[PDB]
């Protein structure tokens, strides 16, 4: 027949399986005679048959998962036989499955990826666990640690196969939590029959998507910089936040097309740092404030640009020095132009602003001009005090304009004002009065003297012409004696002067200047004094001579003594001084010192008596010399007759 038994797996060595002999009705000891034996090819290492008793034992521990591997039916087929008579028997030992194996996952560490943009209700398949046992001891269910985000959907397909699924219950946000960690378990149907459990650690990667745009913490930024800030100066460090992952979170900055081209020139913006710096010259005088239209953009797909605006206020700095500009200037200023006469006009500018653009002026020199201002920054240069061309030839006026910044800026400009001349000085003569000494009987048409004169003014106003002012001299005109060279001022004699008739005269000589508005002139006086010269000869006036060129006869008494006075000779000279001094002498007529005559007087007196002489026929006859003491010395002589009457 069919012999049947049932036994569990993993039974101990020696476990009772079944008594073949008893189930077949053959007594214990008759078995040995009949050749009770196991067919050789049907022997299994798992079963050992005791030939003496007919009882089956487990010989090697049976592992159902090793012999059948998930087969629904696990039967071991053995065969036994007896001899005389021959009897063959099939023996089926059905192996039963026990829950000695838990379910297991091929990957104990599992990772599934989900976009943070996943719609709830979406399902995400999962690794199926494997339980090598069969039937009620195989895979029974999946469990996930309780959470809000995911649930488990277990589906059975018939086929006794149970595989799992994830169910997203709520929307994910990678920006809040990008990694989720849950425990995944699978349990079998073991209910010591008890349940076994398997595990897989579950990790959700949350995928990113460009669901955030770059964000400026302000829509408008305002920064103030000083003008002339050096290129490279930090304007502002812009910042557009994007918490996304990777390129979706990388931001790049640029200028929006709204920006003015000028600001594009003057500003540079590093597209990756967002640093906005100066790349030109900030000229407050060109514009005081600039608009920078910036846009940021993330490098993810479907990128949407963000915007912002930086307003740069330029601070004014003192970088423009004042400029001076004369409207009109004149160099022609008269000396007699009263104080207040205008000489020049000018205006000042400073293209700065605020206190940097205010200008104050000073005139340099401590000179006879003042600055006057009606409207500020419009000026006049005027005369302070009266001018004197004779004291000031020209002038150099330098104006200095200086602004009210720090550092202050100053400019200077010079104009030269030439002092014009007026005929306001009268000529003066080298001397108030001159002394001219002229020889008697001089040369007519001769240079006798020279006069000088000087005038302080300029050119014509000091060009001199000389004159002899008309007067009267010896009953007629003064031009009869002297003429003046109207250019040189020379005094010339025109006639030979006779000291005896005229000896001195005086004329007022004049010098006029070439004055066009009003001629000016001065005068002086010249005294012509006349040297006397011995041109008159002396002549005797006493004693009076005879009729017709006949000597004077003065009687000497021969009866007379030494020192006896005869008479005195008097002469005359029309000259003056040593030219009319008079001395007297005798050359011939005296005999051995018989007579004597005085140097100055001309007195004849006897030196000695008349020895050896008594009224001789031939009387004595002297010759007397009258002389003056000038050069040339002139003389005149006379004859005397001394007759002897006692
Ligand atoms: C540009 O913008 C970014 C983002 O706004 C600024 O990042 C700032 O960075 C500091 C320093 O890393 C952050 O402080 C951090 O705090 C955490 C505490 O959670 C700490 O773990 C870190 O060690 C660090 O101390 C700060 O939160 C963050 N600021 C903001 C508003 O998020 C960056 O500073 C900006 N740069 C410029 C030049 O503007
Ligand atoms: C020659 O020059 C003298 C010096 O300038 C003249 O003297 C002046 O004469 C005026 C005319 O009356 C007087 O008012 C002034 O007081 C005089 N000046 C001085 C300094 O005393 C003089 O008049 C001139 N001669 C002539 C003929 O005109
Ligand atoms: C398998 O084992 C786990 C404990 O590790 C249980 O939670 C489960 O019910 C089954 O007994
Ligand atoms: C898998 O393993 C975990 C521990 O990692 C158990 O807690 C669970 O019951 C299953 O046996
Ligand atoms: C008068 O005459 C005498 C001579 O008689 C001269 O010597 C003198 O020089 C003057 O002419
Ligand atoms: Ca087993
Ligand atoms: Ca088993
Ligand atoms: Ca199992
Ligand atoms: Ca998000
Ligand atoms: Ca994102
Ligand atoms: Ca982004
Ligand atoms: Ca400037
Ligand atoms: Ca300026
Ligand atoms: Ca200035
Ligand atoms: Ca003058
Ligand atoms: Ca003058
Ligand atoms: Ca003059
Ligand atoms: Ca004479
Ligand atoms: Ca004379
Ligand atoms: Ca004489
Ligand atoms: Cl004369
Ligand atoms: Na849930």
Swiss-Prot record:
Residues 2-105, 106-216, 217-324, 325-429, 430-540, 548-646 form the Cadherin domain. Moderately expressed in all regions of the brain examined, as well as in testis and ovary, and low expression in all other tissues tested. It comes from the Eukaryota. It is found in: Cell membrane. Residues 2-646 are extracellular. One of its GO terms (biological process) is nervous system development. Glycans are attached at residues 239, 523. GO terms for cellular component: glutamatergic synapse; plasma membrane; postsynaptic membrane. GO terms for molecular function: calcium ion binding. Keywords: Calcium, Cell adhesion, Cell membrane, Glycoprotein, Membrane, Receptor, Repeat, Signal, Transmembrane, Transmembrane helix. Potential calcium-dependent cell-adhesion protein. (Microbial infection) Acts as a receptor for Western equine encephalitis virus. This is Protocadherin-10. The lineage of its organism: Eukaryota, Metazoa, Chordata, Craniata, Vertebrata. The chain holds residues 18 to 680 of 1040 of the full protein.
């Amino acid at each position: 027949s069919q012999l049947h038994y049932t036994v569990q797996e993993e039974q101990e060595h020696g476990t009772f399986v079944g008594n073949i002999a008893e189930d077949l009705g053959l007594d214990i000891t008759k078995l040995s005679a009949r050749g009770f034996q196991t067919v050789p090819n049907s022997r299994t290492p798992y079963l050992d048959l005791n030939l003496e008793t007919g009882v089956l034992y487990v010989n090697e521990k049976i592992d159902r998962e090793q012999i059948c591997k998930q087969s629904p039916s696990c039967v071991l087929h053995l065969e036994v036989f007896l001899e005389n008579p021959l009897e063959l028997f099939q023996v089926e030992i059905e192996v039963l499955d026990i829950n000695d194996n838990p379910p297991s996952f091929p990957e104990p560490d599992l990772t599934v990826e989900i976009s943070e943009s996943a719609t709830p209700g979406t399902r995400f398949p999962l690794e199926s666990a494997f339980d090598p046992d069969v039937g009620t001891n195989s895979l029974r269910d999946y469990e996930i640690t309780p959470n809000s985000y995911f649930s488990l959907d277990v589906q059975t397909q018939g086929d006794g196969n149970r595989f799992a699924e994830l169910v997203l219950e709520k929307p994910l946000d990678r920006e809040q939590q990008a990694v989720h960690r849950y425990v995944l378990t699978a349990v079998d149907g073991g209910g010591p029959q008890q349940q076994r459990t398997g595990t897989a650690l579950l990790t959700i990667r949350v995928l990113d998507s460009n669901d955030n745009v770059p964000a400026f913490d302000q829509p408008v930024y305002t920064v103030s910089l000083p003008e002339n800030s050096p290129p490279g100066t930090l304007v502002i460090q812009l910042n557009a936040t994007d918490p996304d992952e990777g390129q979706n979170g990388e931001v790049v900055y640029s200028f929006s097309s709204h920006i003015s081209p000028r600001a594009r020139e003057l500003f540079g913006l590093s597209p990756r740092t967002g640093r906005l710096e100066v790349s030109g010259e900030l000229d407050y005088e060109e514009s005081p404030v600039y608009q920078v239209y910036v846009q940021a953009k993330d490098l993810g797909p479907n990128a949407v640009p963000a915007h912002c605006k930086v307003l740069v206020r330029v601070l004014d700095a003192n970088d423009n020095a004042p400029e001076i500009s004369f409207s009109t200037v004149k160099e022609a200023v008269s000396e007699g132009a009263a104080p207040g006469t205008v000489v020049a006009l000018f205006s000042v500018t400073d293209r700065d602003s605020e206190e940097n653009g205010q200008v104050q002026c000073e005139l340099l020199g401590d000179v006879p001009f003042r600055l006057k201002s009606s409207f500020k920054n419009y000026y006049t240069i005027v005369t302070e005090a009266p001018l004197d061309r004779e004291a000031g030839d020209s002038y150099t006026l330098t104006v200095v304009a200086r602004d009210r910044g720090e550092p202050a800026l100053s400019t200077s400009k010079s104009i030269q004002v030439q002092v014009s001349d007026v005929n306001d000085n009268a000529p003066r003569f080298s001397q108030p009065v001159y002394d001219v000494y002229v020889t008697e009987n001089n040369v007519p048409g001769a240079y006798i003297y020279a006069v000088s004169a000087t005038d302080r003014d300029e050119g014509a106003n000091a060009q001199l012409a000389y004159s002899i002012l008309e007067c009267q001299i010896q009953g007629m005109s003064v031009f009869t004696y002297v003429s003046i060279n109207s250019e040189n001022g020379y005094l010339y004699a025109l006639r030979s002067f006779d000291y005896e008739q005229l000896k001195d005269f005086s004329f007022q000589v004049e010098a006029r200047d070439a004055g066009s508005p009003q001629a000016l002139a001065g005068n002086a006086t010249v005294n012509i004094l006349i040297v006397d010269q011995n041109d008159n000869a002396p002549a005797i006036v006493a004693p009076l001579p005879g009729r017709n060129g006949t000597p004077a006869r003065e009687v000497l008494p021969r009866s007379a003594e030494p020192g006896y006075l005869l008479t005195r000779v008097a002469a005359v000279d029309a000259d003056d001084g040593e030219n009319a001094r008079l001395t007297y002498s005798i050359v011939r007529g005296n005999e051995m010192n018989l007579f004597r005559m005085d140097w100055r007087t001309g007195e004849l007196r006897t030196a000695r008596r008349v020895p050896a002489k008594r009224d001789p026929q031939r009387p004595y006859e002297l010759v007397i010399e009258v002389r003056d003491h000038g050069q040339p010395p002139l003389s005149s002589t006379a004859t005397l007759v001394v007759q002897l009457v006692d």
